[model samples]
Target: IAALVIDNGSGMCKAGFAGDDAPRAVFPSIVGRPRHQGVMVGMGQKDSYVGDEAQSKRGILTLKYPIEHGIVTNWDDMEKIWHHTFYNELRVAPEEHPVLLTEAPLNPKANREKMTQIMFETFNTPAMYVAIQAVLSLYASGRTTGIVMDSGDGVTHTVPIYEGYALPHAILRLDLAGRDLTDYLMKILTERGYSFTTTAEREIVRDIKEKLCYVALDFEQEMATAASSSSLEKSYELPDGQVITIGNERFRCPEALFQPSFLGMESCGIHETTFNSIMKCDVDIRKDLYANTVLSGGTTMYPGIADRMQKEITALAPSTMKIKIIAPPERKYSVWIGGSILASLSTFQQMWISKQEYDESGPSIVHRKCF
Candidate 1:
């Protein structure tokens, strides 16, 4: 049977069968409950909504993210998400296939055990394997040993992987990411007398950012020419049919990734985080890490991000070292793609923690089986 692969991120969840090019379902990792429970029941609608359905019912529902900063905080909502992925999204029985799940770097052992328990006891899968997100991303870029920098909606993480295993001690995280960029864009627009305070309006701002934002290769040069250049300005029509002119904010918003100080945070930029993570590894591996820096996650989709990251990290690395940034075309779903690749491999079959092993050793078997 084809294995099931689920890459659950803080912002979005990607789910599909192994050997597939992409996930069958990609949706926001959020669950929504109706504001007035009676209204939903009277209309014969489901009690709760997940993913895009939740977003669509924003006015009548209260939205909540089950995962935060790449970690699952609410198991109830997360179960709802997984349940929806299996039944509604993929339309498959969980027991029929082995499952592969992607987890955040440095995820707690307790969480891993809990995940194992849920998969076996709740979903009753034949077997399961949990892989670190960074390592899987590295695999997606065709490297077992490299540096994976993943910046999603909630946080940015720079993790060094060696021979398919993540260097937990060398992992670094930044609380700035796509959500921060959206908020920054909203702030910029607000300063220009445009108000986007509600949840739906903020989503519009996020859409605007995704559609228009691009990293400037040379920040100082871009800022200097932004005001005088008409090309830097764009007009976006809001849902209410109001046209709002967006100017320097496009590049200025994503600039936070390079300069966290812009967001009032006392942390280094993502490039610095990557450099620091590589430096934390062994001296011999540092060079290899530099030569194979892999980019993953949605925020990295901005035009020129790879170029800017390569430039910034190169500036910080030793002059003799060769710096390379591997930004794959499917980076937004790299974690899922990597899991798909791994689960489809014949050699990986023995690596999964089978139901027999789980029943004997209990959930702790996950820690021993999946590194």
Candidate 2:
């Protein structure tokens, strides 16, 4: 029972055969139509490109990120990405495999129906299973009950999973996320005379965020050192061989997650969001949920981030409850990995809606079968 598992996210897309530990195909959810600049490599080619190839020709390409805030906005570009995922990346014939795709927590019902329509009608897969990304992230960490705090490129979501099912009412969302921090860093750089105007430059700022930025355990103390331009300062060299010095911006940028006031967002930080979601559930499960706090998604990959979150949560949580934050080394691919795990299970095979079932029941069948 082979299945193609994919986690299509706002920032990136991952797809691979079931039972694999990691995705065979990983790329940004962006498509590009290059204008063929004579100076740029591969720009002379007329066909559109996806991911790195698309990013490489950014100067010449009209790049389009098909997905936004966890919803597919451009079906045509998304179609191109899926084709590349199946034909070029995974090298699989869609008709031969069942497909297990992940969707955002609290995603619109219409979005789910459309996803089912695309898989069965467009790709022509044998079967399809749409999963909540938060539940999958919990499953990836080998848990059935926990609170999942996912901070990705566009948004941060906290979902409480109870015995393998997400408690939809208990879910909490925040406007703060990876891109927010990236934009903050970009602003800081620009203020210092290193402005990034192009897509490629933004990519570099993203890299800088990943490589140099970190979550401070004591942000105020750290900011003081950074402000004084002490040992906290680090220099990063750009693509054009220009070196820029960074100080307080490293921790200051990430501070937006804890204190959204820095970015003028009214929502509380990730720690409070986790606590709010946990409190929304039944009183009996609060301890269980607190004990199994799992942190996934790329934004949680920053140095000392899990510990910082743990500290904040511990201070706010009940005294009797034991708080544990499980941030696996492969947090970024947790959803995709969980999809692969679920797709391999015999019980999960029955969960997928067959193409015939969809043909008979129509797109509405997804709400009945997958939910």
Candidate 3:
């Protein structure tokens, strides 16, 4: 028998058999096929590889996104890619398996049931356990209440945790994510004559984003000097020892999180959105949450993210609020800390729902599936 943990966040799924290794890991829940550099890989391909390398070659092979808007839209295709993930870790089948799955706040009950049913049908795992990402982070932090804002590839989910549980009504999600930033970066690069139509060149742009990106605290001022000579300029190397210089005057990329409404979405800045979520929980619970606002996910790893979040949230909040961003040292694995903790616990081992529920309940009770 073995323990399994899965965090199906927007960007990828952090799943693995339970242990003290790596602390956290990932598998994009999407299913797709890769092709030769010049060949287009449309959505119809039957078999293919699944992982970071496959995704990095997007232009080389026309790719398909298995999880659009953060949920599985195609089940038939998922099984194949999903197996790639399981076998990569499992290597061999054990006699019994106890699995843990992560969900978002206010998940469509139907989706929950389908996933549980899939686990029972696809793999011979004996039992399943489920929890929301925010709740798990809160659990690992030992924080009774506070907000957890995870900004990643597909969605930015902000959920308040209280007394070791998620407040569904208090959860808020932003549609923009890390992919949007990549798009934004590419757009800016295109405007500067950078062609991202090839895989290798795109990699160059990705490095540019990593080495020289920041949130434009003063966007107007930055924009004024971006195109002209200014101190906020950076450069990156391309395929042939060539260098491209970018005026750090770029603003909209980082500013998008603060003002996505300009992009025609009904959303507030990350800090305000988080504060608004915190307000919906019980007053006493929110007090403790203030002392432990945990940050996680890849995007949060961006420089100045935490400071920016703290600054904005503090400006709008009352003086009584004592916010402490008790995020894990490893930012990428921060979101999985709670799941790791639960997976290691003996109590959690016993809390898993058995395959009997999957066989018996069928797919009728997804939201109600979690206990």
Candidate 4:
């Protein structure tokens, strides 16, 4: 049977069968419920909405994100998301297929055990495997060893993997990412006499960021010429038919990834984080890690992001050391793709934590079986 792959991201969830070219279902990882509990009782509306459906409810409902900073904090809502994925999205019977799930780097041991319990106990799957998001991303890029820089809606993590195993101590995480950039853009727009405070309105701002934002090759030079360069400024039409001109904010928003100080945080930028992570590993692996720096996640989708990372890290490293950033075409879903690839491998069949093993050793068996 084809296994199921679920990459549950903070901003979006990608779900489909393993070995597929791409995920069959991709939607926001959010839940929505009517603001008033009794508002939609007779309208044949769902008690709650998941993914894009939840996003569409907007002002009519209160939205909640189950996962935060790459961890699932609300289990009830998360279960609902999985339920929708199995029944409404993939149309699969959970019991019939093995499951491949992705988790964030340094995810708590308790979280892993909890996930294992849910997969076997709740979903009743025959087998399951939970893989780190970074490692899988590296795998998707066709490498067994590398530094995977994954920045999605919730957080940015730079992890070093050597021969398919993650070096936990060398991993670096930044609390800011795509959602932060969207908020930063909204902040700039607010200062420019525009307001986007509502959930739906903030989504529009996020759309603006994704569609209009680009990392600056030379941030200072771009800032200097922003006011004088027509090419640097663009106009966006809001749903109400009003046009808003975006100026320096286009580049300034994404600049935060390179300079977290822009967001008033004292952390190093992504390039610095990557370099620092590689430095923490053994000296023998540093060169290979630098050479195979892989990029993944939705936040990494910004144009010039990979090039900017390459440039900045190059400047920070020794002149003789080579640095390369592999931004794959399918990076936005690389975690899922990697899961798909891994679950379908003939050699990987025994890697799964079978239901029988779980019954014998319990959920704690996941740590030994998966990692």
Candidate 5:
């Protein structure tokens, strides 16, 4: 079975032949399938839901985003989205290629087993195997220990990998992810009296975050300024041309990563939170993994996230330790880029388990083969 890699990432499906084509499609684990056909595609990934013949001629597609937080929480909609996407990818089926799929670390045992069953039943593959989506980067990268912060629509999870496997408890999940941040921005703007009537509001705020957002070098000062009685603080412009004082909401959003509490959750922020998560591992594990911290996911795209994270790490970490968020070091593409590298491994096929193994080894076997 040649590499017919299927990266079923929580947020995306990065699949294609190793070294052949860039994963030809990336749809949100979300989709929109109307209760009836001939309806328009729902509000979801723009490129994925739109069809040429359907969009141009029918204009009947309805909105459907099959995923919620990177996983297929809604099975029925998921079937429609996945069925379309997979069929599209396998239109010219790979001549009985055994599939190499990827799943998340600490994925529910039921979820893992269900995935394997789907492959066997869906496409009738000769063999099928699964890998913890991000851990496979270890086979190609020589590092034996490091942190993998996977940022996606659902959540940004910080997982520590050592000796080629993830230390489960050490892995942490921050509820603060792309969706939370987006909603945070939307709420702030709306409260400021901005209607955000068009789809452009989301795009504009995102663009603002990319171009202007950053963890404040001085959090307290920034916070006080926003809360101050004076109007000297800076504000940013919305797409509609109205400007809200940056002092009002600018710092709040980026700060969310470092301090989720500002939004009222008792949950940890990426700052102290990540540090706390890392320390949960074995005594010596933290040191080896500290310098190796690698940030991926869409949320890392914020302009000043890396430097701010570094600053926070510097303050929270022992003065002697080292840390770095491997950018393209561009954080936005880190996970997806790793996808390509994972696809290129020569020993990649050896990572799979056959149907016999799935049967003999059972669900628990997924953990053995995956991480």
Candidate 6:
């Protein structure tokens, strides 16, 4: 069977067939709901819309998120969203293919059990396999094992993968990421007299961040340049066509990744977190870990983020060994790319949780078979 791979992310869901280089469809992990659940049944409209359509209908339709903090919070909505992505977006039936899915590191066993049950009972798939996003990233980078520093929408995790398995004890996480950065950027914009008050407004702020933000190699000098020259300022036109002058605030907002105190979060930044996670493992692999560190996730897409991470960790390193941060050309889709690689491997076929296994052993088999 041609396997279908889905990487469920907090901000977006990427789905496609195995062996594909990129996801066939990437959509927001959101749903647009009618004010009343069944009201649209005879009105020639969907009761709930998924992906871009859901986001486009935000003004009139109530928005609902199936996942929160990197975990599935609303299972029913998530199932519906998956169905929509398969049948409607990809034009494929879920039952006709084996499925490969990705999940957050250190996800609860109960969650995996429930996911297995849903795949077997609801989608009626021939097989299912779930892998940790971090491990998949390591695989995507053509490595059997390394330190995976994943800066996602809602959470940033540093996990050590040794010999194709994730070492759970060494995993570290911060409850701060792209969403926090966007929120901080919005706050800074508001403080600077740029006003916006809707989700769409927040999106505009994110675009501003992506287009204008970067890690300051020399924060003081960069700030000075931004303060002294009009050249550093860019005029960002909002969705409503209101123009705002963005200056140092662009880089300053993302600086929070290196120094969380910028956002009033008393936590270590990504570099420190990655270094700490590596130190938790056995002494033999510390050098290997430093040399093979892989940075993945949408938040790392910020300009100069990978370079800044390399600089910070090198500055804090005790060894004179080279520190390399391998960031994919496309950080946002790296996890999905990794999933595609794993699903296409012939050796990986045995890992799939078959329908017969689930039928006899039940959902708990997910915990046993899909570690």
Clash pairs detected, candidate 2 = none
Q: What is the C-alpha RMSD of each candidate to the true structure, in Å?
A: 1.6, 3.0, 4.0, 1.8, 5.1, 2.0
Query: What is candidate 1's lDDT per residue for 1-371, written digit by digit as tens?
Result: 99999988879889999999999998889999888766585766477888879888767788788876888888778888998788888889899989999888888898888789899999999999989988999888889999998888997899899998888889998878988889988988888888789566798999988898899899998987887787788889888989888878888988999998888989999899999999898899999989999989888889899899889998998999898989997899899899999999999989989999999999998889998
Misplaced by over 4 Å in model 3 are 21-27, 33-49, 52-63, 88-90, 198-203, 216-231, 249-252, 261-266, 360-371
lDDT of 2: 0.85
Q: After superposition, how far is residue 288 of candidate 1 from its true place, in Å?
A: 0.2
Error of 3 at 334 (Å): 2.4
Q: Where is model 4 more than 4 Å wrong at Cα?
A: 33-37, 40-47, 58-60
Q: Name the runs in model 6 displaced over 4 angstroms.
A: 37-46
- Can you write out model 2's per-residue Cα lDDT over 1-371, one digit (the tens) per residue? 58999888877888898999989888788898755555346434546877768877666676888765777888778888888788877887899988999888887888888888988889998999998888999899899899998878886899998987789889888857889988888888888888887445787898889899889999988968766767998889999899988888888888889888877788799998898999998999899888898888988888888888789999998887788889998888899889999999888868899988999999898889885
Tens digit of per-residue lDDT, candidate 4, span 1-371 = 88998988777889999999899999878888677856565586577877778877657778798876889888778888898788787898999999999988888898888889989989999899999998999888899999998988988899899988899899888879988899999999888888888555787899999899888989998988886778788999999888998989889999899998878889999989998999998899999988998889888888998899889999999788888889997889899899999999999889888999999999999899887
Candidate 3, 366: how far from true, in Å?
Answer: 6.2
- Clash counts per candidate, in order, are 0, 0, 4, 0, 29, 0
Model 2 scores worst on lDDT over the 10 consecutive residues at 37-46
Worst 10 residues of 6 by lDDT: 37-46
lDDT of predicted model 6: 0.84
Best candidate, TM-score: 1
User: Between prediction 4 and prediction 6, which has the larger lDDT?
Assistant: 4
Taking the tens digit of each residue's C-alpha lDDT, what string does model 6 give over 107-135?
A: 88888887898899999999999888888
Candidate with more favorable, higher TM-score: 1 or 2? 1
Arranged by lDDT, best first: 1, 4, 2, 6, 3, 5
Q: Estimate each model's TM-score.
A: 0.96, 0.91, 0.83, 0.95, 0.78, 0.94
Superior candidate under lDDT, 2 versus 3: 2
How much is the lDDT of residue 361 in candidate 5?
69
